[model samples]
Target: SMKTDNAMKKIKLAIDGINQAIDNFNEVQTFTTINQLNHFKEKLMNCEHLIQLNNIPDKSHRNLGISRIIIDQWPFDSELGCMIINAESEYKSL
Candidate 1:
């Protein structure tokens, strides 16, 4: 439905951060241990499914929903918190 110069670089790099972070994430996942490993994988499997829903035809507010929940404060448990905030900004700009 739209495009803009304001967010090009911001969201561009943001998406790439996910790529790089996901790679590093998997590296850490494997080295950590099997029992804990499956949990993280399942977490992201659910996450990825959410992203797919939001990106569909580029016209949905689901990402914003994810963004808000992600922005919520968690304990040290949600390591991905640092990377997750971009979901809202990315789509908010898009």
Candidate 2:
């Protein structure tokens, strides 16, 4: 399915915002404690993944079987979230 120009533009803006936030967070986090910085990095990575899912050009490939919950939100699955969280936690722990 083709997305309208307006919708694409809006999604583009969202991607830009998320990217900027991740970059900005990284920049400031460098001065923080190593543990805190790692946690922040993990969060940004997760957010970036979510943003990419929303911005994918092809929508049909992303359709979720659930009606209310879209496929884009699939990244929010608890298993994935726990994995991400644990990775960061370990990074900081070391």
Candidate 3:
């Protein structure tokens, strides 16, 4: 149980940082941050999948909550989606 708590804590902390970075880049509005955003997405996605696979009921609910937040906010929210569009434009020019 202690191990499970520790694991969840680490994942939660990492996702918070990832979300923070997104919020920061959104404010900056820089296309250069897209790659970093993608990295963050991968980390969050993997964390979600791993947590879901654990079969711990409470942890599973927590994972679902986190996953919902990411899904509902990222790329769907206008600001973040616009940032992504700008990033794609940057990539196209490269």
Candidate 4:
């Protein structure tokens, strides 16, 4: 029962960060970011899946990996990158 609660907690956190990051990037309007956004669609599906919602694969760790990829690919100190990094760190805290 305790472990189930932990999964619920972690899943909740991941879903939040993943959704926020996706929205954030969409507002950026970069084609590459949109491409990256497409990448997240399935992860969000997986995150939302447990809540009863893919080649579009499903998992949590890969979501963080996507964050890593974005932060690495993006400018290190731009406002956009800063926002994204915050979101990744949010998941990192988990």
Candidate 5:
């Protein structure tokens, strides 16, 4: 339970990065197109659903799973990648 809790916290922190990225995009130049933002929003929506689900994977797999979902769902050289990098940077600092 503790591991799950910790993993969730990390996931939450990582997700914050995405939120921050979105906010930053609004405040300055980042995302090149509305579609990128839309896709990122969709990704965030899915993340919310994942967080709400009760069937979270084990701690050993949770972060990896999260990363896979985050990275696999988007191309690395795209807007989502920027968000992912930002999110991961936040996660590492925490």
Candidate 6:
């Protein structure tokens, strides 16, 4: 139970932190610090890890609709002259 609670807390913290960073980047027009923003990104990745821990993926599934798991959209809402726009991260990689 303690481990579960810890994981939940960590995930929530990471989510909150990333949200604030994104909002700041959009609103104030800058990250307080580049390293801080990168740290938040790392924390967000850790949150993803926690989700994977709780919901392990099925490796043997051959026929699957994995499209739903990917965020194929990007720069959904950007204030003009606020931030650079680009394709969604995963799609950009393709």
Model 2 stretches with alpha carbons more than 4 Å out: 1-3, 26-94
Among these predictions, the greatest lDDT belongs to 4
Model 4: number of backbone collisions: 0
Clashing pairs in 5: none
Candidate 3, residues 30-87: lDDT per residue as tens digits?
Answer: 3336565566566445644654676433422333233333355555554444433333
Question: Which consecutive 10 residues in model 2 have the weakest lDDT in total?
Answer: 62-71
lDDT of 1 by residue, 2-87 (tens): 34333344344445554555666664452343343344344434444544465432545434454444445333354444444543
Q: Lowest lDDT 10-mer window, candidate 5?
A: 57-66
- TM-score of structure candidate 1: 0.39
**Cα lDDT tens digits for candidate 2, 1-94:** 2323333343344334434545665543433333443444444454345445665324334322221221233244433333334333332222
What's the lDDT for candidate 1? 0.44
Query: In model 3, where do residues sit more than 4 Å from their true spots?
Result: 26-32, 55-94
Report the lDDT tens digits of candidate 4 across residue range 1-94. 4543454455555555546666775555553465565565455445445444212123454354655676667666545444445544443343
- Candidate models: Cα lDDT each: 0.44, 0.38, 0.47, 0.50, 0.49, 0.38
For residue 39, model 5's alpha carbon misses the true position, in angstroms, by 4.0
How big is the positional error of residue 75 in model 4, measured in Å on the Cα after superposition?
1.0
| TM-score for each predicted model, relative to the true structure | 0.39, 0.27, 0.40, 0.41, 0.40, 0.32
After superposition, the stretches of candidate 1 with alpha carbons farther than 4 Å from their true spots are 1-3, 26-63, 73-87, 90-94
